[PDB]
Design a binder for these strands. Structure first.
Ligand code: MG
Length: 477
RNA sequence: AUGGGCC
RNA sequence: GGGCCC
């Protein structure tokens, strides 16, 4: 995005500067080059002179203004993707009720009750519970008044900036590159679920290459589906953006919202409006009040879907801006927000697409480090998606998601107080696909201290998950 | 202390 | 209630 004006205001907003993450018994063993992100300006692990505030917002470096020709091309790509999207999903995108928006529906989880309320409720000292009844799915007088203001389209707000407390690479911690969460008001989140929650539920149900979205997927089982798909194509590309979310130019966001969320596709007129309120935002970080134009605020509501949609349109745009006669069937892809895997039988020059992405404000690089630029001849087993490689299970013959051993080590090195036993069981579900030997090594430090699931048990559970009838068939002997 | 999924 | 990924 682009920082248009920063101001100092009396109403302070205390950002939390104290990590919940602590080292584990594995930290001594593995010694990862990872650590909790710096949450304080006076963190000793930082480098001298590093001001944590100026680094956080340095991602905002401009709002790329697209030319008329580029904007016209983008709309055609947005309309063409929207056409494909609503062909698969349908046009049953009518507003969710207040009840269904809170409680959720099949395909869409319920709203989190014990989480940040946003502004100006945190200032006033009232949490989500006081404003919204989550059991019965009704709302108090505060939210209901705000809900009507959004119908009238005279609702302004501020995003509350939280520091994201997480494990990050030591290079990023030393640099002061802590990620941030833009906490919007709970009513904005509710109303956004009202306008497009049906659509969102629908995209979770229909995740896959046909719509180019993995939001809603279960890597455990869906890796078989995605793996076999991308194996059929000659070339595959693992593309990486830098600061994807921030570099969504306002022009692109507006066009996308105009083309995807039209009334003729079964949406409410305010579906576009509420989404367009994300383009120009005001962020509240302590005494600072930073107005921003461009980019997407994380923790919005449909941010994964919105980013994923934009990702699809970018590829169609970039290819159409370099090659002639490109349709959606010229290539295939799957994305989860900024994360993206693309494939095609055509020998597409992705190196030559680089400057065409810079017209949108985005900067693309190959996920592979050593190779100097994009190259042809890569397959699905070379790339990475959702932090997982595509490996073949030689026992079942299915594809399985394998995370790098360093990532698993780093995960296991840190944990919140009194949640380690519950975390170990969760992490085992990921680590199982690394193989019996690597699995045993990963959980070596915890033996005796905690309960560790057997490789056997998690493997058998997985086989039933990917294909139930296969598991019963394996009982032939 | 997080909308989005996902045992 | 927790974890993973975005
Ligand atoms: Mg990638």
């Amino acid at each position: 995005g682009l920082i248009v004006d920063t101001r100092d205001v009396e109403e302070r907003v205390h950002v939390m500067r104290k990590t919940a993450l602590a080292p584990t018994v594995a930290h001594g063993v593995f010694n990862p080059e990872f650590g909790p992100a710096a949450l304080s300006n006076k963190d000793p692990r930082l480098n001298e002179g590093v001001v944590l505030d100026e680094v956080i917002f340095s991602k905002h470096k401009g709002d790329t203004k697209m030319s008329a020709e580029d904007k016209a091309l983008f709309r055609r790509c947005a309309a063409d993707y929207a056409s494909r999207l609503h062909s698969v999903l349908g046009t049953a995108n009518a507003p969710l009720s207040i009840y269904e928006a809170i409680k959720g529906v099949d395909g869409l989880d319920a709203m989190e009750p014990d989480t940040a309320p946003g502004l100006p409720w945190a200032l006033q000292g009232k949490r989500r519970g006081a404003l919204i009844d989550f059991e019965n799915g009704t709302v108090g007088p505060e939210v209901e008044a705000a809900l009507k203001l959004m119908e009238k389209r005279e609702y302004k707000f501020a995003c509350q900036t939280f520091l994201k407390d997480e494990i990050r690479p030591m290079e990023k911690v030393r640099a002061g590159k802590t990620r941030i969460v833009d906490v919007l008001p709970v009513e904005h989140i509710l109303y956004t679920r009202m306008m497009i929650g049906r659509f969102c539920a629908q995209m979770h149900s229909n995740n896959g290459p046909q719509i180019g979205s993995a939001v809603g997927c279960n890597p455990d089982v869906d890796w078989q589906r995605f793996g076999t798909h991308f194996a059929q194509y000659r070339n595959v590309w693992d593309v990486d953006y830098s600061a994807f979310d921030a570099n969504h130019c306002s022009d692109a966001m507006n066009i996308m919202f105009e083309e995807v969320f039209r009334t003729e596709f079964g949406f409410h007129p305010n579906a576009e409006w509420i989404l367009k309120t994300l383009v120009n935002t005001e962020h509240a970080y302590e005494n600072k009040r930073i107005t921003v134009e461009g980019g997407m605020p994380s923790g919005c509501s449909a941010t994964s879907i919105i980013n994923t949609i934009l990702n699809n349109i970018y590829v169609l745009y970039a290819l159409r801006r370099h090659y002639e006669g490109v349709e959606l069937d010229t290539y295939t892809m799957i994305s989860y927000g900024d994360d993206i895997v693309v494939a095609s039988d055509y020998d597409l020059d992705f190196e030559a697409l680089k400057p065409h992405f810079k017209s949108l404000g985005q900067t693309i690089t190959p996920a592979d480090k050593s190779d100097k630029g994009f190259v042809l001849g890569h397959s699905i087993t070379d790339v990475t998606f959702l932090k997982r490689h595509f490996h073949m299970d030689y026992g079942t013959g299915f594809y399985k998601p394998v995370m790098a051993s360093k990532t698993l080590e780093a995960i296991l090195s840190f944990a919140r107080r009194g949640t380690i036993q519950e975390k170990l069981i969760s992490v085992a579900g990921l680590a199982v696909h690394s193989g019996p030997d690597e699995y045993r090594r990963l959980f070596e430090p915890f033996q005796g201290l905690f309960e560790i699931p057997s490789y056997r048990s998690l493997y058998l559970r997985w086989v039933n998950a990917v294909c139930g009838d296969a598991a019963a068939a394996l009982e032939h002997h």
